[PDB]
Every structure is written in structure tokens, then in C-alpha cells.
Amino acid sequence: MNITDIREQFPILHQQVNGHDLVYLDSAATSQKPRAVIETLDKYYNQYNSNVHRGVHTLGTRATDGYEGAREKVRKFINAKSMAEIIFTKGTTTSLNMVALSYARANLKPGDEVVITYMEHHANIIPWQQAVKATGATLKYIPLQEDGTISLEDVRETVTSNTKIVAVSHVSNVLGTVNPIKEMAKIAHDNGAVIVVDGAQSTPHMKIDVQDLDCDFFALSSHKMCGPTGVGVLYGKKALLENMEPAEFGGEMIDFVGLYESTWKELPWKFEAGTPIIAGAIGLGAAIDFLEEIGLDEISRHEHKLAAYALERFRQLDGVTVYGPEERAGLVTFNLDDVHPHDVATVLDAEGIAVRAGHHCAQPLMKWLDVTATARASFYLYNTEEEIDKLVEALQKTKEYFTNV
Amino acid sequence: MNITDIREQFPILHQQVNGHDLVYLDSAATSQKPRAVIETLDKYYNQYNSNVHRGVHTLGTRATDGYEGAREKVRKFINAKSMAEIIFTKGTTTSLNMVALSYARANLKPGDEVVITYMEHHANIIPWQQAVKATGATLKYIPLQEDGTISLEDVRETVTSNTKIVAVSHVSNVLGTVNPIKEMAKIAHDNGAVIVVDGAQSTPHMKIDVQDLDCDFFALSSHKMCGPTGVGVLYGKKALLENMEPAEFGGEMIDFVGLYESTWKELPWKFEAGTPIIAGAIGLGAAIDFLEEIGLDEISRHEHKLAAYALERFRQLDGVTVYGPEERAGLVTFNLDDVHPHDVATVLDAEGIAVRAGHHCAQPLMKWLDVTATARASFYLYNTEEEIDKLVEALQKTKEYFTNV
Numbered sequence: 087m088n089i090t091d092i093r094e095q096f097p098i099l100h101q102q103v104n105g106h107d108l109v110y111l112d113s114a115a116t117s118q119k120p121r122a123v124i125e126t127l128d129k130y131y132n133q134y135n136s137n138v139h140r141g142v143h144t145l146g147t148r149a150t151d152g153y154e155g156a157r158e159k160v161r162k163f164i165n166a167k168s169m170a171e172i173i174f175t176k177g178t179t180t181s182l183n184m185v186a187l188s189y190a191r192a193n194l195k196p197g198d199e200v201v202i203t204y205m206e207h208h209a210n211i212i213p214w215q216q217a218v219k220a221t222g223a224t225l226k227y228i229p230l231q232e233d234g235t236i237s238l239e240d241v242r243e244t245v246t247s248n249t250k251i252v253a254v255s256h257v258s259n260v261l262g263t264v265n266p267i268k269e270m271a272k273i274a275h276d277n278g279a280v281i282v283v284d285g286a287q288s289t290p291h292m293k294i295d296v297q298d299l300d301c302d303f304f305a306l307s308s309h310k311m312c313g314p315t316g317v318g319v320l321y322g323k324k325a326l327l328e329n330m331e332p333a334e335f336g337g338e339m340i341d342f343v344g345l346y347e348s349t350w351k352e353l354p355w356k357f358e359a360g361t362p363i364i365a366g367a368i369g370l371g372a373a374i375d376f377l378e379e380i381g382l383d384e385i386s387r388h389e390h391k392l393a394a395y396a397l398e399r400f401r402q403l404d405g406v407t408v409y410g411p412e413e414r415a416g417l418v419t420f421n422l423d424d425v426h427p428h429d430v431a432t433v434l435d436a437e438g439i440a441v442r443a444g445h446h447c448a449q450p451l452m453k454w455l456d457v458t459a460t461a462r463a464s465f466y467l468y469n470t471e472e473e474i475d476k477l478v479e480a481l482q483k484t485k486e487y488f489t490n491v
Numbered sequence: 492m493n494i495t496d497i498r499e500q501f502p503i504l505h506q507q508v509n510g511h512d513l514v515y516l517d518s519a520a521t522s523q524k525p526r527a528v529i530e531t532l533d534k535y536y537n538q539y540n541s542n543v544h545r546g547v548h549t550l551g552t553r554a555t556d557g558y559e560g561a562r563e564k565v566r567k568f569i570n571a572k573s574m575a576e577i578i579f580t581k582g583t584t585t586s587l588n589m590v591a592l593s594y595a596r597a598n599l600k601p602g603d604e605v606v607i608t609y610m611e612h613h614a615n616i617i618p619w620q621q622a623v624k625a626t627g628a629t630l631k632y633i634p635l636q637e638d639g640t641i642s643l644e645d646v647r648e649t650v651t652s653n654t655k656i657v658a659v660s661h662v663s664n665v666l667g668t669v670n671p672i673k674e675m676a677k678i679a680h681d682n683g684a685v686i687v688v689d690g691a692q693s694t695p696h697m698k699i700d701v702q703d704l705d706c707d708f709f710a711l712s713s714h715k716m717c718g719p720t721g722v723g724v725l726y727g728k729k730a731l732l733e734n735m736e737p738a739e740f741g742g743e744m745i746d747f748v749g750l751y752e753s754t755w756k757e758l759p760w761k762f763e764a765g766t767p768i769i770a771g772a773i774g775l776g777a778a779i780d781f782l783e784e785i786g787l788d789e790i791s792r793h794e795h796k797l798a799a800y801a802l803e804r805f806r807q808l809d810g811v812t813v814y815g816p817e818e819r820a821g822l823v824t825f826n827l828d829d830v831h832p833h834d835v836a837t838v839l840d841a842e843g844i845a846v847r848a849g850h851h852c853a854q855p856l857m858k859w860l861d862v863t864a865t866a867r868a869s870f871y872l873y874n875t876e877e878e879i880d881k882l883v884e885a886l887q888k889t890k891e892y893f894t895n896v
């Protein structure tokens with residue numbers, strides 16, 4: 087894996103910001119796209135754009151073939167059994183909302199429990215809040231260890247025989263934690279529940295295997311894995327998706343429509359109302375081709391190299407708190423003593439370094455850490471150790487400057 | 492309005508299909524994009540792609556500015572009062588589903604009536620079916636005149652004092668009918684109801700004025716107005732959108748998130764959960780710039796010219812049934828005597844002519860016409876009278892061939 091060759095594929099990286107070279111370290115918010123994906127979108131809009139499953143002319147069949155081939159690329163990418171288990175959505179948030187509306191709100195009686203965690207993104211929290219409010223069920227949280235990890239014993243103690251849904255993220259966007267999804271799925275099934283994996287932060291950086299994890303649902307976003315914005319994937323076990331009513335209604339997802347009642351299509355189109363995100367899904371397929379061409383194991387090893395390097399360099403700075411475990415994904419969430427994270431992000435952007443500051447759409451975790459805000463630098467397959475050097479040097483300069491104030 | 496200059500902007504038009512030049516006549520399914528829109532997507536992914544409202548670095552603010560400027564372009568394009576009334580959705584289907592889930596299912600008691608029409612797209616039918624099923628309300632239909640138009644007297648007789656929602660399309664994707672949306676809104680308000688306009692087929696071809704129409708909701712799709720796929724707009728009156736609960740939950744749309752309850756953001760972000768369709772919405776803004784540069788009145792006049800020409804040329808063929816009124820939009824829905832529409836579409840694609848065959852996601856209308864299937868040729872701002880000549884000549888050749896069989 088030559089990283090110069092990879093960086094040469096992303097045109098947005100080769101620019102300057104406020105005089106300095108661009109050091110993009112906000113991939114956990116969104117990733118950049120290689121020429122393959124952008125040129126896939128270009129070829130679609132330039133050559134064979136047409137509506138899919140709706141008119142059998144040449145361009146129509148070309149577009150339909152591209153769309154469904156992207157669906158099968160997704161099926162192979164995450165090792166799903168059937169592409170009937172692969173549903174194209176607007177993103178991870180929309181997929182989680184779909185599971186919460188079509189599975190949760192239809193399979194929860196009072197006394198049933200929905201268990202999430204303290205590190206969950208807001209997308210994996212509020213849908214469950216609203217579902218248990220609509221059904222009168224109970225929302226429970228799995229506590230976290232002092233290093234930000236989850237122990238399986240805490241899981242077993244939190245999920246009971248009255249639990250219907252375990253909702254948990256694969257990788258934490260704040261802590262960098264890689265949660266034990268496999269054993270958690272075993273635990274949830276032993277108690278008669280299903281498991282919903284928020285895989286928004288894991289899918290771009292590590293290989294996914296729905297079979298090995300035995301997850302009942304899995305949600306991912308394309309803009310974080312070098313794919314176009316506005317498209318994501320919901321994976322559900324075919325047996326579960328068959329008994330779930332559609333979250334949306336309209337064309338493409340119906341079989342027969344009478345004046346008052348209608349019947350639905352087979353999977354997966356039962357859950358894809360209206361004209362789908364054609365170009366977006368085909369570009370996501372291009373992104374999957376690109377990632378598999380580089381190799382997801384290689385990307386994971388590069389990420390772990392960057393993360394260990396960043397943790398060591400951060401420990402070389404004093405006056406910096408880093409949140410989360412040692413074994414982690416490629417992101418570092420931190421704060422500087424006596425400097426607010428927004429000012430850190432501002433002065434880092436003055437140096438052309440792009441980081442995120444705030445709660446990262448995880449306020450319960452922020453209060454769990456007893457912090458109000460937080461800075462974060464996230465790495466992907468185009469980031470170098472030289473960029474982490476620039477980051478830690480600018481952090482030392484920020485500390486020296488604010489101390490001199 | 493020079494149409495050669497316009498056709499030069501769409502690269503997909505200059506290709507051949509099965510030996511013949513491409514004659515794209517399926518714009519009612521999806522439209523083609525000019526270089527402005529594709530190059531807007533290219534510039535976004537090449538220069539300033541970043542997550543919006545989430546990290547204040549330079550690329551982040553550039554992307555946020557582009558996204559919100561596209562929102563304001565949409566507000567100007569349809570004359571909305573405030574961009575708090577402009578919500579970016581996945582498409583017309585998703586916007587109609589949002590109105591049906593967040594307004595209908597929360598403001599319908601048994602005895603309330605929801606009135607639609609016989610010509611409505613499936614997207615403007617099944618959401619109301621499911622809403623009245625969830626609430627126990629009543630679904631009613633406004634009958635159609637023998638020429639496929641709606642009379643205001645039939646409206647007044649159908650909508651009563653127990654009606655909460657009139658749901659009607661602005662332009663019919665099958666009939667070409669332009670419904671009297673303004674007077675229908677007056678009628679609905681006189682009976683204490685709101686009005687939901689399915690403007691999927693009107694927005695690309697004619698000027699929209701939410702103020703003049705006084706519609707309570709308006710749904711549009713971007714892929715039909717030269718914009719990217721996967722993005723559309725829901726317009727709701729600010730006073731109505733303020734009292735509607737969000738259809739989706741997650742990041743970006745919340746203010747405070749506790750363990751069990753959360754509070755929402757202001758409009759419009761209250762209805763935009765998760766990472767939004769950034770590139771898609773910015774490309775839709777580019778499409779709006781392009782359309783306003785040509786002029787929507789000019790596009791409407793070109794459409795009426797093409798439609799009158801096509802109606803006359805079709806009447807020059809015998810053995811052809813055309814469905815709908817004389818005054819119409821730029822689409823012709825038809826059938827040939829003793830030839831099935833799928834075969835018509837196949838032999839037209841052999842000549843490189845792209846038409847749609849089937850029910851066009853409007854089965855109730857198909858049975859209302861006492862037909863099972865149907866062919867359709869739709870025109871947009873890049874279609875010429877020479878292409879309609881090719882269409883009618885290929886139709887005559889198809890008639891001669893199938894008669895010789």
C-alpha cells in the first residue's frame with residue numbers, strides 16, 4: 087500500500103488553506119473521494135442516466151444494470167447472503183430510523199426493553215427514544231468502563247429476557263472504541279433480542295462480515311467510505327425484513343394498487359420508495375471497487391499505524407487529555423488544558439489543519455466524560471504520519487501561545 | 492431560447508443507440524443534466540467537500556455555505572417566504588411520505604376525510620392510504636371528467652367540512668393535465684383543510700409560486716429538473732412545519748439530547764436528520780441557476796409548442812388513442828390499436844427512441860381509462876419537433892409492420 091499513489095487520486099487534497107497546505111483530519115465527519123468515484127458519477131450523468139426499473143429502453147437498462155450491480159457489490163462487500171438484504175437508504179441515520187420505525191414500533195410492548203450504550207451517536211439514540219415513547223417500552227443503557235470500552239459482563243447484566251433490541255455501534259466516532267459486536271450479538275440472541283449495528287464508522291476502515299458478526303441489522307453511510315453523499319445502506323436479515331412493513335410508500339415498492347389498499351414488492355425494493363439514488367449508489371459501488379482494490383486489511387493496518395503514532399505523539403505533549411482506549415480506530419478525541427476546543431480548531435484551521443470541535447453528535451457521552459465540548463482529529467487512507475506531526479506541532483504552538491496570553 | 496445551444500450543454504444527448512441517433516423522450520421518468528450541474532458536482536468533490544454545520548474549518552464553511560445557498564436558491568425559485576419552509580428530502584415520494592407521517596397521522600381522527608384524485612401518482616396515494624388506515628379516517632377520491640381534467644364543482648362536492656387534507660398533483664405524469672391548484676387550495680381552505688401539491692411534474696417545466704397558489708405543502712424532485720438524483724424538496728407553510736414532529740431523528744436536527752428525551756432544532760434543520768445530501772442539493776441549486784438562466788416561461792412556451800405539435804401529429808395517425816386534455820404539459824400518453832405498448836417501446840428503442848411503457852406508477856388511472864398498460868413520450872427543454880417527427884414516423888412504421896404480421 088503506497089500512500090503517495092493513493093493521495094494522488096484525491097484532487098481535493100492538493101490545495102492550500104489560509105496560506106498553509108491542506109491537512110484534512112476530519113474524515114470521521116466525511117471522507118474525500120478519489121477520481122474513480124467522481125468520474126463514475128461523471129460517466130453516469132454523461133452516458134447512461136435514466137430512471138431504473140421504469141422503461142426498458144437502452145439507457146434505462148444500462149442505468150438499472152448499474153444500480154443493481156452496485157447493490158450486488160454492496161452485498162459482496164459486507165458478505166450478505168442475498169441482495170434482498172441490501173437496501174439503499176439516505177444514510178446511516180435513515181437506516182437506523184427505518185429499523186426503529188418498521189421493526190421497533192411494531193414489535194415492542196410495555197415491559198420490553200431497548201438497550202443502547204452511553205457512547206452511541208445521536209442517530210443510534212433518538213430513534214430508540216421515540217420508539218419506546220410510542221410503544222411505552224423501556225430504554226436502558228449499557229454502562230462504560232473507565233477507559234471507554236464495553237465489557238461483555240456489563241452487557242449480560244444490562245440485557246435481560248425482556249429485551250427486544252440491542253442497539254450498538256461498531257466503532258465509536260468519539261472514543262475510537264471497537265466494540266465486541268460478535269459476542270454482543272450472541273448475548274442478545276441468548277436473551278431473545280435482535281442486534282442493530284451502527285457501522286457508520288467501521289465500514290470505511292475495516293472489513294465487515296454480516297455472517298461472522300451475526301448482526302440482525304447493520305447501517306452504513308457512503309460519504310465516509312469515499313462514496314457520494316446522500317446514500318447509505320441498511321442490511322437486515324432477510325427473514326426479518328420480510329415481516330417488516332415499509333417505512334415509505336410510493337412507486338417502485340408496490341405490486342398492486344387499488345383505491346384503498348396496496349400490496350408490496352419483494353425484497354429489497356419493498357423498502358425503496360420512489361425514484362432511488364441511482365447515481366449515488368453507482369458511485370458507492372465505485373467506492374467499494376476502489377477500497378477492495380486497495381484492500382480493507384491494508385487500510386485497517388494503515389489506520390492502526392496512524393492511531394498508535396498519534397497516541398504516542400499526543401502522550402509526548404503534556405496538558406492534553408485524550409479520551410478512549412488504547413486499541414482503537416484511526417481517530418483521536420482530545421482537549422488541551424485551559425484551551426477551549428473551538429479555539430483549538432480555529433487556530434489549527436489557521437495552520438490549514440481541519441479538525442472537528444463540539445460534542446460530535448454525542449452529548450450523553452460528553453457528559454459521561456464530564457466535558458461540555460471536545461476536539462477531534464480523524465484519519466483515513468490518505469493521511470500520513472507527517473500530517474500527525476503537523477497536528478501535534480500546531481497543538482504545542484497553540485499551548486505555548488495561549489499560555490503566553 | 493435557442494435550442495441548439497441548449498442541446499450542446501447535455502453530453503448524453505450526443506450518442507447513438509442500436510445504430511440510430513438517440514431520441515430521448517422519457518423526461519417524465521428522469522431528465523438529463525447540463526454541463527453546469529455535472530461540473531458543479533465535480534467542483535464540490537474536487538475542491539470543498541466537507542460535512543456541513545459540523546466543524547468550522549475552511550472546507551467545512553465552504554460546504555455549509557454552498558448547501559445553505561442552494562436552500563436559498565430553492566426558496567427564491569418557488570417564491571417561498573422563508574428558507575425555514577424549504578426542507579431537503581430524498582425526493583417527491585419522501586416529501587409526500589413526510590407530510591403523511593408528520594402531519595396526517597397526527598391530525599386525523601375518525602370521521603376526518605382525506606381526498607385525493609384518480610390521476611394521482613402512487614407516491615400521492617399510498618401514503619394517504621396508510622395514514623387513514625393508521626388513524627381510522629376516510630379516503631375519498633375526486634372523480635375526473637371524460638377528458639381527464641378536474642372540475643371545481645366536483646371538488647366542492649367531494650371535499651366536505653370533515654376533510655382535513657386535499658392531496659392533488661400539479662401536473663399529471665400520465666394525462667399531462669395541469670390541475671387548478673389555486674382554486675383547489677381556496678376550496679380546501681374554505682372547508683378547513685390543508686392542500687398538498689405533488690409538484691413533481693410541474694416544477695421542471697413551469698414557474699412555481701407558493702404564495703400565489705397558497706398551497707400548504709409542495710413536493711418536488713430534483714432529477715426531473717436537470718438536477719442530481721437522490722434529492723428533492725418539501726415546502727410547508729412555516730406555521731404548519733412548526734407544529735409537525737420530525738419524521739426522522741438523529742444528529743443535526745436536535746438541540747439537547749438527554750438519556751431519554753431530546754429537543755429539536757429550528758426550521759428547517761428540524762426535518763433534516765443525519766448528514767444531508769450536500770452535493771446533491773448544491774447540484775440542484777446549479778440546476779435552478781441553469782433553468783432561471785434560460786427562463787421558466789420560455790421553457791413553458793417551448794413545452795406547449797412541442798405538445799401542440801405532438802398532439803396534431805398524433806391525430807395525423809389513425810389507430811392511435813391519446814389520453815388526456817388538449818391543454819396539457821409536454822407529454823403524450825397513448826396506445827396503438829392492436830399493438831401492446833411494451834412492443835411499441837421495444838421497436839421504438841430499436842430506432843433509438845426512448846419512451847416509457849406500463850402503468851407509469853398510476854394503476855387507478857389505468858383502470859379509470861379501462862387500459863392495463865400504456866405508452867408515453869415526454870418532452871423537456873432539449874427536445875425538438877424533429878424528434879416528434881421521428882417518433883410519429885416510427886409509430887407509423889410500427890403500425891404498418893404489425894399490420895403486416
Ligand SMILES: Cc1ncc(COP(=O)(O)O)c(CN[C@@H](CS)C(=O)O)c1O
Nearest residue numbers: 114115177178179207259286307765766
Ligand atoms: C458512529 C456514527 N453513527 C452515525 C453517524 C451519523 O451517520 P450519517 O451518515 O451522518 O447519517 C455518525 C456520523 N456523525 C458524524 C457527523 S455528525 C461525525 O462527524 O462523527 C457516526 O460517527
Ligand SMILES: Cc1ncc(COP(=O)(O)O)c(CN[C@@H](CS)C(=O)O)c1O
Nearest residue numbers: 360361519520582583584612664691712
Ligand atoms: C406526478 C408525480 N408525482 C410523483 C412522482 C414520483 O416522484 P419521485 O421523484 O420518483 O420520488 C412522479 C414520477 N414518477 C415517475 C417515475 S415512477 C414517472 O416516470 O412518471 C410523478 O410523475
